[PDB]
């Protein structure tokens, strides 16, 4: 996360890390058995890590659970990262407690100006590799489609929204992919892509989770 | 354009003029070698003029590039103007510069109420014929399907949308056909037809370019 | 390759394809037993295809040779694609002829403005997935370090260079990775990355091969 | 390690933890600047942690050094894990002493019956995700080729050996990968794979390090 702050101990307890083999992505817990992440972080076998804020050391709260099903969106497109969302079913349910909680699915789509929180263990800089051991947090607004489309002309689909700062300086970054953008208790975004990190007029692009409410429901109900 | 203004030197720089001695239609530059226009403006050999917004005062501003391929949509229907879109391949690439730029192809359709810009050297009047040497611009909204269908019952296909003002007064007009309707740096419409110009309850009808993103991409890729 | 042309029969005969699983990358033949490509195209076992022009049909000119060793650069960084170069040793020598030839390694780094040729069977479109059957070629210049750095702020290392057109319209694209940039008969770049394809102010970024001349010699001698 | 014991303080002072935020594989120090691990543990940037048996406590003895080169065996096959060995060059030399020492390379291959020591911070359970903070050790014998091949028909190559107990109960496990099997002061194996952990007739399979004495020696001498 570039220009964010370390999350408080009690914050962001829905946050998951995925060991997609040896690649790292974030994710978020939406029920005791299901995790959502970005489809570009796919691997057929993933270990989900929960209840962690400092990944370098033991805090006693950690839960490591392997996936049993990994379901990429049917129309995920690796060319432009359209429909960059995936669901992971855990082989055993997570034990919810203070450090491991679920985040609610969106009831509706959030509008521009809604303030949200993004979180992750990704890169702290847009010109060098600096990765944190504690989870970082960042408050940011959803930006208008006019802003989003003018920042990335011809690249933004209906399944994407931009969030962050056109002046740059604060953004999600590499390693945050798959992680949650939560607005008023609901999961509205999945960290997906951007050009560089925290550059002016290049805000982050997030998968628009409120477009997938039926798909996520349907998939959980019958898998 | 009826009821517009002279375009600011920087706006509408993606504007092309289709000529064969006379300039008869507009178009827009989507890459250094491709122009999109309206299929009803078809001629087998077209000289494309790029440059200065004033087509009379030349001082080496202009570039005149001949067409090497002109491809109408395969299902263009001249009775109702369905699929009124065409691509023109330039025999040499345009010099992109302060006068000449490209517009991006849409990755999503625009919604009713998005504000857009139309431009052209067409007729300034809904009563007389009076044509400008300086490119005119008009800011206009996309209208809802219900208003469009109310205005032209049984004549709007899914490949058409209405834009403009139901009160009349401001509209594109004859000679503007083939020209760009750009919303948030993206080509959303091609000027196609209407009943008169700037009449009450007869808004301009435009080819809905977002329905052609795959046909445009494939035709450019393969030719 | 976006905006390029079909390579002549006899040109680019140093071009290889790597069927690295279901990943396809380009590569180039530098001796009868060694191929150069991008480290991000790595797979443990690779089938190298040589002498191809049309990859969809049998041509009577192909040599299909399996790798015996695949050696990524020791400091390849998958996070920012620094040192994106790999050497592949063929399990038997290729027979060189009019269709299969080697390219020379660089005696020096090429300067801005040198005209080069990039080739590959990657995507023809920056707005859709359209892959060719026949090998495509594109003539392009090496750009200045300042243009490259302003196109990709904070991301360009000394082991990378940009080549192409700041105007967009012509570029290499997905699937061209690992393929050759040859300037005056010497291999100067390996197709590595870019944001989108053929967009304004986003030229391709290429691995700077002239930085690896001793590594390539030493590796070929020790393996 | 399933069924082992916490290593004595001087035991396994050649043990390395490979980290990328979290511990993900083991390794062993073979000189002040080189570490051997398993190629399936590859990451392009690794932090090597040496000198402390409790992975979660910064108690004192610890050296944390970043990798500068990561070199997988050139013919590593990810499919069957043949030649599952990798060398990591350190950016700074490690200080050797009572808590950090090197392990000798093998001068000949160990035979069946040789008793050896495996170590790691891997999973403690073959049915649960259970990871230790303190380094575990397990004394185990090399098994015959016949036992190895009847346990894993058609999957054992000449570059692999089995070690452990055919009755099960004691084995290395996930997270121990890349770590050392030392016999009579020399590194004979690298933890590579197995079916499950500590299962009956499914002993651990290890990379046969005595087959790579020349490759390790030339690679260290040319990089
Ligand atoms: Ca062929």
Swiss-Prot record, chains A, B, C, D:
SUPFAM superfamilies in alphabetical order: Trypsin-like serine proteases
UniProt site (Required for specificity): 171
Active-site residues (renumbered): 40, 84, 177
Disulfide bonds: 7-137, 25-41, 109-210, 116-183, 148-162, 173-197
Keywords carried by this UniProt record: Calcium, Digestion, Disulfide bond, Hydrolase, Metal-binding, Protease, Secreted, Serine protease, Signal, Zymogen
Catalytic activity: Preferential cleavage: Arg-|-Xaa, Lys-|-Xaa
CDD domains recorded: Tryp_SPc
GO MF entries: metal ion binding; serine-type endopeptidase activity
Entry EC no(s): 3.4.21.4
Superkingdom of the organism of origin: Eukaryota
Cofactor descriptive note: Binds 1 Ca(2+) ion per subunit.
Any single GO BP term: digestion
Annotated Ca(2+) binding sites: 52, 54, 57, 62
Flavoprotein in keyword set: no
Location(s), subcellular: Secreted, Extracellular space
GO cellular component, one term: extracellular space
CC cofactor: Ca(2+)
Alphabetical list of PANTHER family matching this protein: RIKEN CDNA 2210010C04 GENE, TRYPSIN-RELATED
Name of protein: Trypsin-3
């Amino acid at each position: 996360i570039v220009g964010g702050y370390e999350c408080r101990k009690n914050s962001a307890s829905y946050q998951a890390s995925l060991q997609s083999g040896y690649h790292f992505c974030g994710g978020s817990l939406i029920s005791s058995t299901w995790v959502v992440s970005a489809a570009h972080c796919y691997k057929s076998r993933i270990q989900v890590r929960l209840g962690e804020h400092n990944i370098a050391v033991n805090e006693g709260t950690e839960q490591f659970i392997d996936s049993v099903k990994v379901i990429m969106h049917p129309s995920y497109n690796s060319r432009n990262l359209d429909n960059d969302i995936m669901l992971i079913k855990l082989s055993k349910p997570a034990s919810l407690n203070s450090y491991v909680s679920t985040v609610a699915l969106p009831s509706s789509c959030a509008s521009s100006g809604t303030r949200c929180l993004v979180s992750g263990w990704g890169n702290l800089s847009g010109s060098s590799s600096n990765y944190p051991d504690t989870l970082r947090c960042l408050d940011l607004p959803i930006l208008s489609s006019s802003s989003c489309n003018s920042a990335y002309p011809g690249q933004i689909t209906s399944n994407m929204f931009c969030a962050g700062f056109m002046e740059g300086g604060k953004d999600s970054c590499q390693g945050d992919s798959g992680g949650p953008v939560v607005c008023n208790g609901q999961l509205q975004g999945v960290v997906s892509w951007g050009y560089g990190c925290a550059q002016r007029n290049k805000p982050g692009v997030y998968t628009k989770v409120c477009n997938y409410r039926s798909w996520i429901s349907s998939t959980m109900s019958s898998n």
